[PDB]
Amino acid sequence: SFETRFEKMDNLLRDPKSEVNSDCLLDGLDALVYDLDFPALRKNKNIDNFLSRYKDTINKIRDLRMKAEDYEVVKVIGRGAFGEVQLVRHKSTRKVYAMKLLSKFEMIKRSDSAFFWEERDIMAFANSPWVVQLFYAFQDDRYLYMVMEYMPGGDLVNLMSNYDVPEKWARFYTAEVVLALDAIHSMGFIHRDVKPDNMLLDKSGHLKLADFGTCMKMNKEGMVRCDTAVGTPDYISPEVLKSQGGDGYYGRECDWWSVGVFLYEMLVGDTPFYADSLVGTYSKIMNHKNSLTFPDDNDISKEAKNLICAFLTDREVRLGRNGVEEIKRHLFFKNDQWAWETLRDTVAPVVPDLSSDIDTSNFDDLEETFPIPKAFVGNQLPFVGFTYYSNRRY
Amino acid sequence: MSFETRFEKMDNLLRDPKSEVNSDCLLDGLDALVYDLDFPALRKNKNIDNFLSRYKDTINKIRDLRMKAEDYEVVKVIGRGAFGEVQLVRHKSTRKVYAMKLLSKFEMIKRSDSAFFWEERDIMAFANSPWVVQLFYAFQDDRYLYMVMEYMPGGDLVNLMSNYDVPEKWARFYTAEVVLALDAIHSMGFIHRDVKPDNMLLDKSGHLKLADFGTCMKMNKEGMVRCDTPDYISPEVLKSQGGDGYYGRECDWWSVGVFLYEMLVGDTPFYADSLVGTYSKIMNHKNSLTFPDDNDISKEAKNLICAFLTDREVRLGRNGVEEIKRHLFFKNDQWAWETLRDTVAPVVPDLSSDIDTSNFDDLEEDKGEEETFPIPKAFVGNQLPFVGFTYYSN
């Protein structure tokens, strides 16, 4: 019909999950103008005339749309090779956020684009108290930006380094991780790299997962086919570690192995397969049946030992193969302080004591430009559609 | 300005029919990018290849849903040129009758003339004047630009002049309507530059509407224009064969003088057997303008023709429209300037149906395939000068 065709097209321009909504379309033109504005390419009159025709408009678009200079950077709270995380304050609204920057230069050098899409989607559409929320996502010729709610309580690496974690605390954090991973699993994703580094704490001391650079969408059978290993040397499961491509098929039960590693780390003070070298840590994971031991210190309960061992086994007999309820029913979680359904409403073991909205006390104290192209290379093309601003879900 | 003001201003820009970044122009941007990149040579670049694969399914849906040529049933070809053709069409769904002007993108690129259609698009789309042919929709594909307009069944002034020895009372009516029509264009900030009977169409009532605005240009701050067949063109526009000339709206008044002369004499005043000879006669208008010894032309009609067919510095219309309107030639008892389009026209067309083309000459057949652009080895951007041409009325 004539109206239908018009209405279907109109919904596409408005839909926050559409590849052709206003956000993606503005990204398309912004990328085209960046990728063409070079003296060598401007020798072509089609390119030159187009850029001149859109000059004034592109400057208005770039001024009106969300940009880095709208944010006042308070402190850098995270740093990696692919980018940095910074505590920012939006100059207009005066609102405090955490902003994750990802280097487009770094992503182009090495075939490592495409990882940020699931991190964008999980944070933008999870609508879960267990997942850090994405408020805005934007970009320029140099970086990808993700404006998120700030987690002032810091991460679990910081907590474990400042406290000898008692079992009652370890039960709380393990239980919240179990609920958090289950929310991710329900969305159809496998985390693949669950670690204390990506377990953040809010102003109340309750957990939220962040850093989803390894998340992969499950298939019909709830599986993932991956030829190359993904994760961290200490927390990687044997099945993800040995994945060759010819036989590299695995499910959500790989995230349950990581919980086992996390619980062990909290109660013992070290990872179970730790070695003086990375290659030795690999050897110990592969030989988990003989390398998993507990120190001769009665501090770890029978139930905590049982859970660690129930998780730190081959995927075919691992606790969680039959679902979350078999994990939830484990005697380790038996207590009189909380219940699974009301856990995030209870008072957390460590309630952060914060001086202001820009307090960074739980965070440790802390550019290569693209060469001028001679021909069209389209370095901005793999980032088209990243913007989450003009068409958001409310 | 606030964050909300910035967000809304951006939102209005995506919706505004006069905006260069509304949904129609942004969809054009992506459609052009996909056409210009989808070639085996360019697809060797992974940035280009991955982008096209990512937007494959989405672009096929967009192309199917958006307005296209196959939505229109071509009844008859009513106009033809080197740059394209005009055809009486019927929208297959709505069953509505329109005139559709097609412009060859290959011809526009080849001839290095691909920027003249903007003023024609804008005038017809936004004039909202009973003197300007209305643009209902404007769309495009990799081959043509399309302009879906209100059909003028009464034909043009070339057809009228060829079938009648125009009496002075009719010539007064058509000259007066042309004066009002050009004034509406002038008020919008445009100079026609090539006003001729070919441009002057008649509606179902026999009232004039201007069309074919391929020579139109937007006036500057001082109401001036600079630019780089001559029969109806003024000396100033002809003297500007390289940008060495600044002229105003008074060049359109000269053409009215040429039109009035043509109607009453039967020939253009500066006609010659060759184009170059017509040019020579226009430049020597002071000596070449003569009237035949047939006493038929009135003192007042001769005065107007001469008042218009002079050097721009002493031309009637240099001080505005009111000096033209007050000319004794227009003194009559049939109509008034303010109520002219409400009076009964000298020739009221007698039409058999909504698809009647009796006032349009039958054109010599032209059919087949090909006449397309070669496969590029590098990015050439042949679709770039046409981005933002799409327009849809509400």
Ligand SMILES: O=C(Cc1cccc(OCCCC2CCNCC2)c1)Nc1nc(-c2ccncc2)cs1
């Ligand atoms: O993201 C990081 C750590 C980080 C820092 C800088 C760059 C990063 O990119 C590296 C990944 C690239 C991989 C992709 C797969 N292939 C291998 C390379 C990651 N930390 C976070 N902090 C928060 C947060 C949210 C609210 N409040 C506070 C902090 C949310 S995520």
Ligand SMILES: O=C(Cc1cccc(OCCCC2CCNCC2)c1)Nc1nc(-c2ccncc2)cs1
């Ligand atoms: O446009 C034409 C005539 C025509 C036919 C075919 C192609 C044309 O393009 C050639 C000009 C391009 C030039 C520009 C300057 N640089 C050099 C290239 C023009 N006739 C019209 N008819 C209508 C109408 C509207 C309602 N009902 C019926 C007819 C409205 S415009």
